[PDB]
Amino acid sequence: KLRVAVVGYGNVGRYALEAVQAAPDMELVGVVRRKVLAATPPELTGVRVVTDISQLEGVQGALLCVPTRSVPEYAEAMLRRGIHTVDSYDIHGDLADLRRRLDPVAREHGAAAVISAGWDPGTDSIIRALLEFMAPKGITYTNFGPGMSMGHSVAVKAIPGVRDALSMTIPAGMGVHKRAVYVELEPGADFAEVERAIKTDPYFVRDETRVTQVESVSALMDVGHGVVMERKGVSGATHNQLFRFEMRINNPALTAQVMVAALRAAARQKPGCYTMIEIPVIDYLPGDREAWIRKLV
Template sequence: MEKRRIAVVGFGHVGCGAVEALEVAPDLELAGVVLQDEGEIRRACCSLGSVPVVRHLAELEKVDAALLAVPSRCVPKLAPPILETGVATVDCYDIHGDPLMTLRATLDPIAREHGTAAVISAGWDPGTDSVVRTLLEALVPRGITYTNFGPGMSMGHTVVIKGFEGVEDALSLTIPKGCGLHKRYVYLKTRPGTDFDALVARISQDPYFAHDEVHFFPCEDVQALVDTGHAVHLERRGSAGKTHNQKVDFLMSVTNPAATGQVLVSAARAVLRQRPGAYTLPEIPPVDFLPGDRESLLHRLI
C-alpha cells in the first residue's frame, strides 16, 4: 500500500505531536515540515534529522495534505492558498461558534473549485468532543449537555496571551466550575517596563477571555508551572423517547499536544476520503478516520 504524504505546517507543541503521530501511522508518511522562523527551522532540523524542513510547501515533493499546526487566527489566511494548489488541508482551529462556521463557509467553495477538501477544527474541542456531543444528543434527544474542561493548560489561550506586547512568557489554565462553567488562571511574566494592570485590561478584552471569569497572577518562572495535561467531562442529561432521567457521561484525560496532533493525523486520513468541500468532524463518517479498508473495519467494529 502506497503511503499518503502529509506535510506539517508549524512545529510548536501541536506540530511536534502531529509529527510523532505520523511516525507511527501505518498508511501515512511525513513529507516534511514547513516553517518561516529561522530559530524554529534550526530547532526542527536538529530534532527531525533527515526530514525536509522548508519555508514553502511547494519545496516538498508530492504532498497530499497539509496539517496546519498553527495558531487559530492564522488559519483563515494560510488555508486558502494551499487549497488553491489542490492540496487538502486539516487545521485545529479552536474558536467556537460563528467564526468557525464562517471559516467553513469560506473554505468550502475554494476546496470545491480546486477539487480538494478541507477539515476544520480537527482538535479535541472543537473536534472529537463535537462528535461525542452529537452522539450524546442522538442517545438523549431532549436535554442539556454540559462540557466541563480541565483542569489543564489551554494551548490556544496561552498562545494568544504570548502574542500581546509586553508579555515575555505566559500560561493559561482552564479550571472547571461544573455544569459547563469555567474560570481561567493566567500566569504572566512581563517584559521590563510593562504596566501589569494595563496589560491585564487588554487581555481581558480579547474574545478568547472576554466572556470568562479570569484571574491574573504575576509570575517570574512560568515554565516551572507548565503541565500540558488537560481533561474534559461531557455530561448529557435528559429524556429518550418518553423516558426521563437519562444520563450519559464521557470522560477524557490527555496530554493536550499529543491528543491534538493525533486528531490532526487521523483527520488527514479522513480528508483524503471526502468529496471536494470543507467539513467539520461531525460531518465525516467515523470509520474514515481509521487506517484500513472500510469493510474490514466495519467487521471488526460492529
C-alpha cells in the same frame, strides 16, 4: 500511502510529525516552516524542511499546524494547489462560516478540506452529536480543564509590566469556567495594577479570575488537559438518561493525532469542505472497512 506535509513546526506541529510517522498509511514528505536555520533541530535531522510546500515532492495532504487566525489563508493556499488540508481551527463562533468559505475553493481545485479537527472542536463535537440524538431533550455540559489556555495566556502577557504569564482554565461545573492566572512581573511593575488589569480585561471579566505572582512561569507549564462532558436527558419519552465522557490527555499530542485521522478521511471525500460530524467515523480509520466493522461494531 498518502504523502503528507506538516505545516508549522510549533507545539501541535511537533506532535504531528510523530503522528504521521506512526501512521501505517502515510508517508511524511517533509515540514514547511517560515524560516529554516542552519542549526537543525535534532529530531529533524533526517527530515526535509523547507519554506515552500512546492519543494516537497508529490505532497497530497497537508496538516495545517498554524495559528488559528492563519488557517483561512493557509487552507486556501494549499487547496488552490490541489492539496487536501486539515486544520484544528478552534473558533466555535465562526467555523461554520469558514466551512462555507473553503467549500468552493476545495471543490474547484479537486481537493477536500476538513476543518476544526482537534478534540474541541473536533472529536468532542462528534460526542456532543451522539448525546444529542441518543437523548434529544435535555442539556449537555462541556467542562474543560484543568489545563492552560493559549489565548488567555497571550492576552495577559501583552499587558505592560508582565514579563510572562500562564492562564489556567478551571472547570467550575455545569459548563462554567474560572481562571487561575500566574504572572511573572517586570522590573518595577506593580502587582495590584496588573491584577485588576487582568480581572478587568474582556478575556476574564466574564469569569471568576484569580491572580498569583510567581518567580517563574515556565516552571509551571504542562500541556496536559482534559474534559468532562455530561448529559441528563430524555430518550423518546423516558427521562433521566445519564451520560458522561471524560479525557485526561496531552493537548497537542491528541490534536495532532486527530488531525492525522481527519486528513486520512479528507483524502477519501468528494471535493469540498467538511467538519468532523459530516464524515462517517470509519473513514477516520486506516485500511479496508470490513476489518474495522468486525473489530469495533
